[PDB]
Point group: C2
Chain length 132, copies 2
Amino acid sequence: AQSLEVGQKARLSKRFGAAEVAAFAALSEDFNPLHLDPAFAATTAFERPIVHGMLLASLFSGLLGQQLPGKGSIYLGQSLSFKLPVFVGDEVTAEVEVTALREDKPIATLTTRIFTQGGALAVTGEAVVKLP
Amino acid sequence: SAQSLEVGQKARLSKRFGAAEVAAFAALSEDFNPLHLDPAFAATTAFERPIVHGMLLASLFSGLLGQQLPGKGSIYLGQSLSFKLPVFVGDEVTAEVEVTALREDKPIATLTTRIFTQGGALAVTGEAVVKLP
């Protein structure tokens, strides 16, 4: 297509804290105490509050919209598999990698992954986007 | 008595994502794509005006799944999303989920998840897979 090609990657790291998780709860209408209440979380197998899977996934929008392909890009599709919990207060690493470019349309497919602080795969999937 | 989850059960909610909400999502997601904020830039696109992040629209499914159906205690296992139409900042949308399958080997449910525009057109569609409460 253009300067975009298979193999190009972009990443970012972010540590979602309690205030941010609460802000996302308000936007998403997902007020699960498991994400917001330390006392409640302690009564579950998670033991501590975990970040909304969709808050973790939002980072893919940051990568696609601000890095690769960047400004002007438009989401067409996104698949998401939630594998591991991410505890509030812990940092994660988000990464997108171009895996394919459609030959007859300005469309790209990228693998989207979220890694825990320990380097484990917490979220995985693929994004399909229209190029800028 | 306790109400069992059943195929065909549904839930919905409506919400308006205005400038403040879109700005908050941009900050959380790190997605400051001008398509979602700048009217001058947006005017040069086929959308003509600022649109709400598709991933912000999709986040409403988390609210329905965790608060109503299946509800409290539900754990997200997967979510597929296809973005079909834009939602303009300030406009209302309706999020709808419906149970389509309940596995019997494990307490897992599959639900169709859709976002409709204020005009009644499909903006986002897909399926969620969740572990039961």
